Amino acid sequence: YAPENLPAKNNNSEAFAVCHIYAGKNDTFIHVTDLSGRETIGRVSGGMKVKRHCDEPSAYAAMQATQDLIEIITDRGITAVHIKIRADGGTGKRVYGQGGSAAIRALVRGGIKIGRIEDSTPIPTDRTRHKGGRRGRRL
Amino acid sequence: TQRKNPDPYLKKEWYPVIAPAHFKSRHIGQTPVTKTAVATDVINHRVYEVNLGDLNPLNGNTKFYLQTQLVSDGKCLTNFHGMDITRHKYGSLFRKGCDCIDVFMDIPTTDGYLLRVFVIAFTDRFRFQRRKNCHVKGRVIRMMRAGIYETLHNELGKVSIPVLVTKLSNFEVNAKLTEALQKITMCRDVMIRRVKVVKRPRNTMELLSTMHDSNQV
Amino acid sequence: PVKRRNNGRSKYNCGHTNIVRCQNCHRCVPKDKVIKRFTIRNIVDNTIADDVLNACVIQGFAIPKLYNKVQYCVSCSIHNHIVRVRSREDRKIRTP
RNA sequence: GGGACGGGUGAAACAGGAUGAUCCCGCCGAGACCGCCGGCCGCGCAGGCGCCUGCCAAGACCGCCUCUGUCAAUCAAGGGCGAAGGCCGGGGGCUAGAAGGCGAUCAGACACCACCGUAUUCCCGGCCGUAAACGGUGCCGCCCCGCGGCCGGCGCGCGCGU
């Protein structure tokens, strides 16, 4: 890449981005965007690093995807990120999967500085009816 | 079916983003865009979330929203667009045995902006109260709602966007709210939940020029 | 015969109460009969908190928490050991 | 914007993807709903009742050396209200979802699990008049060991605390 194709270097601050984590029960997404969400620098998922469908939310695949993302973004000149940890939400579980902690650790030990952290799970003040009926999943 | 494509990031360049003068730190960061084939217009409108503490190195649970209105000298200028609190603080605010009050009102401005502001209050426990629950009767509740409305009207009935942003950066509105309410009963947490912009004028140049490079202004 | 004086619920001075949904099976349950627990926990678990703080840049940054309310039905609470089946004499104890 | 899977499960497989899907951001539209506070709190004849603002009538209780003077209790016949589902005639059409279809599992599975989905669920006017409509205990009235909690109103005492 040419110098223009990378963030400008200035000692006053460091190149800060934003990382979005989707810690679902079936898959995990690690996504990097600028301060706004209108662009994208690196997008990886745990379904690329495994062959078994049930292992897509497994933490090991999360770590592999995360370190690949680290390689790409460090190539593109990004060192510090903010964290937006999210679950499925929307009349759902509202609890994280098991890939989130793996992603956090993998970022931390990939030489990626950490900024602020917040929860971005979509939650309502109301509720449309969820599936399952009034007797639930009877199995 | 799959095809390879050239790396997008060989035709990209970054631009800086600047904030108004109310804050000590004004460099928000940098934004990439794709080469004109026009960068200026595409990056004309973008909203950046900023934590208040980073703007003013109390301040760690509030964040602002800032939208670009003009690109000049290859750097983007922004003004106020919204204020909100973090989710963990809101979750912490709630405790059983208490009463909750949430009020929202519409407030115009001299510049033509119209804003909706959300206010949240909770009750607390008297120092030597026998009971453990801290609920209150109805007349008290209506008194508190009336006081909230009256104080908000008085301290924000007439205002300008720069003044509003300075007030939000400080906490004088919250201080006035609590002192007005505390004379009624024991309130616990009183503050502004968030601020929204309902409608604004199409053209905002003199306001950006005022907000930016205000320095002494 | 009657097993419990409360009929298995907390319903006093009313006829009907609003309903909720179990979080694991999505069954519909009355609000006064569902089992509720409030939890507070860290977003990052306790083993990596020190690493998170060292990698953080802000000074005095406090770890944000999670505030959630979990609601379970009778069948799912038992299956997940939320409550235990107790003895005849011990059914009258009401402490946590 | 970006470039290869995504969804779903105990595990899978049907439906989605180079017509660029999933993912991030912003905007637009319509219709439902009223959360954490929320409770051995409360209101209502019962069935039942939770967004902001305003309007209309109503009600039990408490306090009173205010008025009347037995005007009361309970009840065949008769009258009114009455969850959900259902029906008639008009509206509207996002979620879920009888019927129906499809993929798994099974000896079989037209069932449990996955996915698509009609009536219905929402509003107005009108029928139906049933529920584990349960405190499985009819209404009015008198006496009755002791301890404790909560709700509303009133009064007393003091060192003035809800």
Ligand SMILES: CC[C@H]1CN2CCc3cc(OC)c(OC)cc3[C@@H]2C[C@@H]1C[C@H]1NCCc2cc(OC)c(OC)cc21
């Ligand atoms: C005889 C039908 C049951 C057997 N099958 C196929 C094999 C299988 C394997 C599983 O992992 C070991 C499994 O997860 C528990 C389920 C099955 C199914 C399940 C069939 C029975 C089904 N209904 C009754 C009991 C039961 C209990 C279950 O545990 C929660 C379950 O998993 C969702 C399914 C079932």
Ligand SMILES: [Mg+2]
């Ligand atoms: Mg079972």
Ligand SMILES: [Mg+2]
């Ligand atoms: Mg029995």
Ligand SMILES: [Mg+2]
């Ligand atoms: Mg009932």
Ligand SMILES: [Mg+2]
């Ligand atoms: Mg009906």
Ligand SMILES: [Mg+2]
């Ligand atoms: Mg009976």
Ligand SMILES: [Zn+2]
């Ligand atoms: Zn459940």
